[PDB]
């Protein structure tokens, strides 16, 4: 009612150990959401044309032309790790569990408030805030998942990551079909490559409105809203990484000579001529059995074209890859393809007290060794005469198409019926948790943006909006713009995510890699004297697992 | 029987999660024990007199004079962490449990073998090993705990720490009463201080024999032996350390001024004159309320005399302390009293392949801040006139007894009815697990050598011995020495220790300190090309706990 | 000391209640566990025993 709270704040995550090493994690998240009336009360169909930028030859990848529908509604998105767990909780999961199961999701809106800004344009022009007791907040839960799915995490537009900092929802918008043509070129490409925005295929047109599709709820202060419980359908997420390469599968060669003394140079030695060894290979015309040569059961990882833009009906797009590299060879310097990069703000990790508008960012280098060093690759003529002769080898060094900065690895693809790979690991806190599968006949084996894809059913999106607070003057037949009383609303959002985890078991003599605070990272987990806060990202499949 | 094994090898530690976050750890340990016939078949009463060494003034602490009974039996001791867990298991316990409960213990002897060395004193004098099928191993379990308790871990004489390395038991010996007088002196002490070994008080005499006190079992190959299950009685062991000092207990002062800017020098400030503040103190004659002055509820830790040797009926002995220091001030360099030091061999951590007879060692610096910086201590006259005047202060700097290298802190003691301390933390792998309480009217509040003291009941000690393998010639009335056939035995020992642990829960926003492998310690957990092995020690109460 | 670090927040640890005018809150009854307190003083010194 008016003087009665309709809800409870809860940002406690509970861990409840079951039988046989199964835990049931239930993450409670609560926020104060602030929401403003819409720019307009209309659906807008807008095109973005940065033709001018692509107009420079060699800049095609800078393409941003698209059409979208702008709606008067806001999206409440809470699908990002940082919304549900803190550095503390993450350590617990990641250091002690071995697999994660996303079970359910629930969210509710309570303690709604609507105020109206009245400006007493005085000397020092003043403004009074008053409560509009009979005003309504509009809530719409698209549970039949009618509207197109728009995960706010790919834009760092989720609820914020700190329970003691109010937040806001994002203006909901969705892609509208368009046709565009852009021919690639390079620095000094004579002429002006076609760069055309053709428009919309009429048979690809779908204009959606919330009002016509979802039931809308008006909540006044006294009201409250609650989604019920949604159960997901998803394969479990592993919290361990693999490290074995094709090169480390199965029985190693028996060493006929073993070091007699300790010493970084006291190697053991297979004792047999590479052309006189027993074993299996798939090199029917050779007697050489080496570790690069001996037969392995399948292939771990695959090679895919790099910095490959493909083009369809709407402009060029980057070809995605399931895993990047990093390790022995790649660090920030040994920079490659396949590793994701996250850009974000003060609400999701960028230091709170930091002044300046450059996003905060990071490149994620996983821990499962399933990628490639293209630099180590080589194709070689089937005769296999060995110190191979410059024209019986194709090295990542020889140029293709006569371009000196392109080699066969950039167009290379070794994916096939023997490829073995793993799904993507969780990215705390900026990563998305779940994703909607494509309603495509044949589906993708994975999604590079979320470890959890719900197939048959996903929770629907939640839309919110201040209903129109009209003034005394209102003429629906005027070609003008509806005049409204400046209204805004504050409401509390409470969400509940439940997971099921399994506890890890030691299996080696040696200890495992664990997340731990230390003298160098310590200050990243506590506030500043100013109260500045930051949320440094962390890794998740720290412990090893044997692949075979 | 002869061709039948009587047991199973098992060195698997099982972790079985129960309800409500309780795990039941059951540590299995198996070893191959090698045992030789006794030097003699007699009990020997021997005195150790290094008078010559103490004969140098200023060397009293080098005293080793004692009497002991040397017995023909060997002790099978498995009470040291390293016998039951590996680096791998320790990480699991220590990073994820919050308290440990020692529940029970069982051990058994199987697959007994007795051989006799026959030397065919040839050119190259040879020796044939043959099985003595009817020979017996003698086993004695002193379950009524009759014999004096002699934990082999204070001498690094436990079973060894690696399951794939055969081991051996220790020759059992126990202290026999003696009377000795040694007067301290120093470099350049005129004369020769009394240094006398008086002998034995007849009323303090207790000669014990295994034969007369415990039932002895003869096992032949076909036999086997098993202790049954013993349950211990012990308070739980905490796996967390405390960090709060008297200085960090309770409500901090309210700061009237807070930093406006971030900056390592942008402090906040109490805003009130130290002599104008409200609050409580125990300084009845002062109006100064400071953090060193304000009242705390009790005292965490205590001050005790350092490098204090005390003397009773049998020579001088070092006064023990419940906790040392280390941290801000002590590292290996800021070396102090209270921290234990462990010396050991190849069977318990010293690198296997290392040549050389110097023990391997380490000083254990715990993590609970409950010790003292004597250097920060000061006594000051009750008038409390403040910039205190050299003769109203006693500083760790002024000399006592006119000795310039002695100050009041070395003789100081602040233990009293407000002292709060914690029991000793576990030392993996060289530390003892359990200890027998003193059969004293009033008992010690703790034991500085084991986190677990069993009061009412402890498992009894296990004694083993090759029975006499006589030759054709044997004359019991000869004043000579019995001649025996050179016999030795190998048997398998299997022990089972069960613990009960509770899983930890995160309670802070920030992560905890966890044990983890890394590029600097990595090679301490895997063998050498030579097969060298080592077992680096680890810490155990890594996570913090609030004291108040 | 990084291993002695514990940052606590109310929000993450205790359930929070929002009360509006119409609301009210009540803790229930908590029972303590404590030895009794004497309301009398002693005056005998070692010098006055027996």
Return the SS3 of A376: helix
Cα B453 from Cα B331, distance rounded (Å): 29
CA dihedral B349, B353, B359, B360 (to 10 degrees): -40
Span between the terminal Cα atoms of chain A, in Å:
62
Contact B136, B150 (CB under 8 A): no
Category of A106 on φ-ψ map: left (φ > 0), alpha (ψ -120 to 50) or beta:
beta
φ and ψ at B462, to 5 degrees?
Answer: -110, 120
Contact B322, B448 (CB under 8 A): yes
Task: Residue A180: count other Cβ atoms within 10 Å of its Cβ.
Answer: 22
Pick among B242, B244, B508 to test the C interface (most C CBs inside 10 A): B508
Of B61, B30, B257, B282, the residue nearest B161 (C-alpha) = B30
Quick check: A262 and B530 CB within 8 A?
Answer: yes
Task: Residue A465: count other Cβ atoms within 10 Å of its Cβ.
Answer: 23
Contacts of B27 in chain A (CB under 8 A): none
Contact B173, B48 (CB under 8 A): no
Cα A351 from Cα A355, distance rounded (Å): 9
- Chain B closest CA to A366's CA: distance in Å? 17
Contacts of A507 in chain B (CB under 8 A): 88
- Choose among B89, B95, B506: nearest Cβ to A514: B95
B129–chain C Cβ distance below 8 A for any pair: no
| Nearest-Cα residue of chain B relative to residue A269 | B529
Contacts of A96 in chain B (CB under 8 A): 95-96
Cα A405 from Cα B239, distance rounded (Å): 58
Quick check: C6 and B544 CB within 8 A?
Answer: yes
**Running DSSP on this structure, what letter comes out for residue A391?**
G
Paired strand residues for B489: B35, B114
Quick check: A12 and C9 CB within 8 A?
Answer: no
**Running DSSP on this structure, what letter comes out for residue B232?**
-
Return the SS3 of A202: helix
| Nearest-Cα residue of chain A relative to residue C15 | A10
User: What are the helix (H) ranges across B112-264?
Assistant: 210-213
C5–chain B Cβ distance below 8 A for any pair: yes
Contacts with A, B 331-370, CB within 8 Å: 353
State the Cα angle at A398 between A395 and A401, rounded to 5°. 130
Give chain B's domain count. 1
Return the SS3 of C5: coil
Q: Alpha-carbon torsion A41, A47, A52, A58, what sign?
A: positive
Cα B290 from Cα B294, distance rounded (Å): 6
What six digits make up the tokens of A304?
A: 């895919």
Quick check: B512 and A516 CB within 8 A?
Answer: yes
**Running DSSP on this structure, what letter comes out for residue A38?**
P
C9–chain B Cβ distance below 8 A for any pair: yes
3-state secondary structure A287-306: CCCCCCCECCCCEECCCCCC
Contacts with C, A 466-495, CB within 8 Å: 492
Chain A neighbors (3+ CB pairs < 8 Å): B, C
DSSP string, A329-373: S-SSSS--SS--EEEE-GGGTS-TT--S-PPEEEE---SS--S--
Binding residues of A for Mg(2+): 144
Paired strand residues for A219: A137
Whether the ω angle into residue A429 lies within 30 degrees of 0, i.e. cis, is: yes
Contact B468, B81 (CB under 8 A): no
- Chain C closest CA to A521's CA: distance in Å? 9
What six digits make up the tokens of A62?
A: 């800078």
Task: Residue A49: count other Cβ atoms within 10 Å of its Cβ.
Answer: 15
A531–chain C Cβ distance below 8 A for any pair: no
Of B96, B514, B24, the residue nearest A503 (C-alpha) = B96
Contacts of B367 in chain C (CB under 8 A): 3
Cα B527 from Cα A497, distance rounded (Å): 45
Of B139, B140, B133, the residue nearest B221 (C-alpha) = B133
Contacts of C18 in chain A (CB under 8 A): 5, 7-9, 111, 492
Contacts of A529 in chain C (CB under 8 A): none
Chain C neighbors (3+ CB pairs < 8 Å): A, B
Of A344, A346, A361, the residue nearest A156 (C-alpha) = A344
Return the SS3 of B138: strand
A1–chain C Cβ distance below 8 A for any pair: yes
- Chain A closest CA to C33's CA: distance in Å? 28
User: What are the helix (H) ranges across B326-424?
Assistant: 408-411
Return the SS3 of B212: helix
Of B491, B474, B487, B472, the residue nearest B135 (C-alpha) = B487
B70–chain C Cβ distance below 8 A for any pair: no
| Alpha-carbon distance values, A89 to B54, B439, B508 (Å) | 59, 47, 9
Which residues, other chains included, contact A110 with Cβ-Cβ below 8 Å and sequence gap of 6+? A5, A6, A7, A8, A224, A225, A491, A492, A494
Contact B524, B534 (CB under 8 A): yes
Quick check: A5 and C23 CB within 8 A?
Answer: yes
Category of B546 on φ-ψ map: left (φ > 0), alpha (ψ -120 to 50) or beta:
beta
Using a 10 angstrom Cβ sphere, with 0-12 exposed, 13-18 middle and 19 or more buried, the burial of residue A97 is: buried
Q: Can you give the residue range of the structural domain that contains B264?
A: 1-548
Resolution in A: 3.0
| Residue ranges of E strands in B422-515 | 434-436, 452-454, 461-466, 487-503
Contact A23, A101 (CB under 8 A): no
Chain position carrying tokens 């109203």:
B392
Cα A418 from Cα A24, distance rounded (Å): 36
Quick check: B327 and C1 CB within 8 A?
Answer: yes
Pairs of residues, one from chain B and one from chain C, whose beta carbons lie less than 8 Å apart: 31
- Chain A closest CA to B260's CA: distance in Å? 6
Chain position carrying tokens 């617990």:
A92
Return the SS3 of B193: coil
Contacts of B510 in chain A (CB under 8 A): 87-88, 517, 522, 525-526
Pick among C4, C6, C14, C18 to test the A interface (most A CBs inside 10 A): C18
Cα B96 from Cα B15, distance rounded (Å): 12
Using a 10 angstrom Cβ sphere, with 0-12 exposed, 13-18 middle and 19 or more buried, the burial of residue A59 is: middle
Quick check: A15 and B505 CB within 8 A?
Answer: yes
Contact B51, B201 (CB under 8 A): no
Pairing of strands B97-120, B126-131: antiparallel
Contact B529, A262 (CB under 8 A): yes
**B144 belongs to an annotated ligand binding site:** yes
- Chain B closest CA to A12's CA: distance in Å? 10
Which residues, other chains included, contact A431 with Cβ-Cβ below 8 Å and sequence gap of 6+? A80, A81, A153, A342, A449, A450
Pairs of residues, one from chain A and one from chain C, whose beta carbons lie less than 8 Å apart: 57
Contacts of A224 in chain C (CB under 8 A): none
- Choose among C2, C7, C9: nearest Cβ to B513: C2
Contact B108, B4 (CB under 8 A): no
Contact A243, A368 (CB under 8 A): yes
State the Cα angle at B423 between B417 and B426, rounded to 5°. 170
Cα A148 from Cα A209, distance rounded (Å): 11
Which residues, other chains included, contact B498 with Cβ-Cβ below 8 Å and sequence gap of 6+? B24, B25, B26, B27, B103, B104, B105
Which residues, other chains included, contact A70 with Cβ-Cβ below 8 Å and sequence gap of 6+? A43, A44, A45, A46, A171, A173
Exposure string (b/e) for B23-48, b if CB count within 10 Å is 16 or more?
A: bebbbbbbbbbebebbeeeebeeeee
Contact A74, A464 (CB under 8 A): yes
Which residues, other chains included, contact B27 with Cβ-Cβ below 8 Å and sequence gap of 6+? B13, B84, B85, B89, B496, B497, B498, B499
φ and ψ at B157, to 5 degrees?
Answer: -125, 40
**Running DSSP on this structure, what letter comes out for residue B519?**
T
Task: Give me the count of residues in chain B.
Answer: 548
Angle at which helices B87-96 and A87-96 cross, to 10°: 150
C1–chain B Cβ distance below 8 A for any pair: yes
**Running DSSP on this structure, what letter comes out for residue A108?**
E
B328–chain C Cβ distance below 8 A for any pair: yes
Contact A393, A407 (CB under 8 A): no
Task: Residue A264: count other Cβ atoms within 10 Å of its Cβ.
Answer: 6
What distance lies between CA A150 and its chain's CA centroid?
12
Cα A460 from Cα B405, distance rounded (Å): 77
What six digits make up the tokens of A232?
A: 């997901």
Using a 10 angstrom Cβ sphere, with 0-12 exposed, 13-18 middle and 19 or more buried, the burial of residue B286 is: middle
Of B514, B542, B304, the residue nearest B425 (C-alpha) = B542
What distance lies between CA B131 and its chain's CA centroid?
40
Which residues, other chains included, contact A205 with Cβ-Cβ below 8 Å and sequence gap of 6+? A176, A177
| Nearest-Cα residue of chain C relative to residue B541 | C3
Cα A516 from Cα B98, distance rounded (Å): 16
Counting Cα atoms < 13 Å in the Cβ hemisphere of A19 gives 0
Whether the ω angle into residue B429 lies within 30 degrees of 0, i.e. cis, is: yes
**Running DSSP on this structure, what letter comes out for residue B281?**
B
What six digits make up the tokens of B473?
A: 């010639």
Of A195, A10, A17, the residue nearest A92 (C-alpha) = A17
Of B86, B82, B80, B532, the residue nearest A510 (C-alpha) = B86
Contacts with B, C 10-49, CB within 8 Å: 12-13
Cα B314 from Cα B391, distance rounded (Å): 41
Quick check: A92 and B510 CB within 8 A?
Answer: no
Contact A248, A291 (CB under 8 A): no
- Chain B closest CA to C13's CA: distance in Å? 7
- Chain A closest CA to C4's CA: distance in Å? 10
User: Is residue B54 within a helix (H) or strand (E), and if so which, with residue range?
Assistant: helix B51-54
Contacts of C25 in chain A (CB under 8 A): none
DSSP string, A238-286: E-EE----GGGSSPPPPPSB--SS--TT---B--S-TTS--S-BS-TT-
Counting Cα atoms < 13 Å in the Cβ hemisphere of B265 gives 0
CA dihedral C26, A489, A72, A84 (to 10 degrees): -40
Chain position carrying tokens 């470890």:
A451
Of B482, B464, B462, the residue nearest B472 (C-alpha) = B482
Pairing of strands A434-436, A452-454: parallel
Contacts of B89 in chain A (CB under 8 A): 506
What six digits make up the tokens of B51?
A: 């008078």
CATH number at residue B411: 2.170.30.10
Which residues, other chains included, contact B292 with Cβ-Cβ below 8 Å and sequence gap of 6+? B247
Contacts of A163 in chain C (CB under 8 A): 9, 11-12
Cα B73 from Cα B214, distance rounded (Å): 12
Cα A508 from Cα B87, distance rounded (Å): 9
φ and ψ at A461, to 5 degrees?
Answer: -80, 155
Cα B419 from Cα B442, distance rounded (Å): 18
Binding residues of A: 144
What six digits make up the tokens of A318?
A: 């980057």
Quick check: B17 and A17 CB within 8 A?
Answer: yes
What six digits make up the tokens of B29?
A: 């340990």
Contacts of A514 in chain B (CB under 8 A): 91, 95, 514-516
Contacts of A518 in chain C (CB under 8 A): 2
Of A422, A365, A421, the residue nearest A540 (C-alpha) = A365
Contact B500, B101 (CB under 8 A): yes
User: Is residue B92 within a helix (H) or strand (E), and if so which, with residue range?
Assistant: helix B87-96
Of B245, B297, B252, the residue nearest B277 (C-alpha) = B252
Quick check: B243 and C12 CB within 8 A?
Answer: no
What six digits make up the tokens of B540?
A: 């155990």
Which residues, other chains included, contact B164 with Cβ-Cβ below 8 Å and sequence gap of 6+? none
């Amino acid at each position: 009612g008016v003087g009665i709270s309709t809800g409870t704040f809860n940002n406690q995550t509970e861990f409840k150990f079951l039988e046989n090493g199964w835990v049931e994690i239930t993450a409670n998240s609560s926020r104060l959401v602030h929401l403003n009336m819409p720019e307009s009360e209309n659906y807008r169909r807008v095109v973005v044309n940065n033709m001018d930028k692509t107009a420079v030859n060699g800049n095609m990848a800078l393409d941003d032309i698209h059409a979208q529908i702008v709606t008067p509604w806001s999206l409440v998105d809470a699908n990002a790790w940082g919304v549900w767990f803190n550095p503390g909780d993450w350590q617990l999961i990641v250091n002690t569990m071995s697999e994660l199961h996303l079970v359910s999701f629930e969210q509710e809106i309570f303690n709604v408030v609507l105020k109206t800004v009245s400006e007493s344009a005085t000397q020092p022009p003043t403004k009074v805030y008053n409560n509009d007791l009979t005003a309504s907040l509009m809530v719409a839960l698209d549970s039949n998942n009618t509207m197109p799915f728009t995960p706010a995490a790919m834009r760092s537009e989720t609820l914020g990551f700190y329970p003691w900092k109010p937040t806001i929802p994002t203006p909901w918008r969705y892609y509208f079909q368009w046709d565009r043509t852009l021919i690639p070129s390079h620095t000094g490409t004579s002429g002006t490559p076609t760069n055309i925005y053709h428009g919309t295929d009429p048979d690809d047109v779908q204009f959606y409105t919330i009002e016509n599709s979802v039931p809308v709820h008006l909540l006044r202060t006294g009201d409250e809203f609650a989604t019920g419980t949604f159960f997901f359908d998803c394969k479990p997420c592993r919290l361990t990484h693999t490290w074995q390469t094709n090169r480390a599968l199965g029985l190693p060669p028996f060493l006929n000579s073993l070091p007699q003394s300790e010493g970084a140079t006291n190697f053991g030695d297979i004792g047999v001529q590479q052309d006189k060894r027993r074993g299996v290979t798939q090199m029917g015309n050779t007697n050489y059995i080496t570790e690069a040569t001996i037969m392995r059961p399948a292939e771990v990882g695959y090679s895919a074209p790099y910095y490959s833009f493909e083009a369809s009906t709407q402009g060029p797009f980057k070809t995605p890859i399931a895993a990047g590299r990093g390790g022995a060879q790649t660090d920030e310097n040994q920079a490659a393809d396949g590793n994701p990069r996250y850009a974000f703000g003060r609400q999701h990790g960028q230091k709170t007290t930091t002044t300046g508008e450059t996003p905060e960012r990071f490149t994620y280098i996983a821990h499962q060794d399933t990628g490639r060093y293209p630099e180590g690759d080589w194709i070689q003529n089937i005769n296999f005469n060995l110190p191979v002769t410059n024209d019986n080898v194709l090295l990542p060094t020889d140029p293709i198409g006569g371009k000196t900065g392109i080699n066969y690895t950039n167009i290379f693809n070794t994916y096939g019926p023997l490829t073995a790979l793993n799904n993507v690991p969780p990215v705390y806190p900026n990563g998305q948790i779940w994703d909607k599968e494509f309603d495509t006949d044949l589906k993708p084996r994975l999604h590079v943006n979320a470890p959890f894809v719900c197939q048959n059913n996903c929770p629907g999106q939640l839309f919110v909006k201040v209903a129109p607070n009209l003034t005394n003057e209102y003429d629906p037949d005027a070609s003008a713009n509806m005049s409204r009383i400046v209204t805004y609303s504050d409401f509390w959002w409470k969400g509940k995510l439940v997971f099921k985890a399994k506890l890890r078991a030691s299996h080696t003599w040696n200890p495992i890699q664990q997340m731990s605070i230390n003298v160098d990272n310590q200050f990243n987990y506590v506030p500043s004297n100013i109260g500045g806060m930051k949320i440094v990202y962390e890794k998740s499949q720290l412990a090893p697992r044997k692949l075979y």
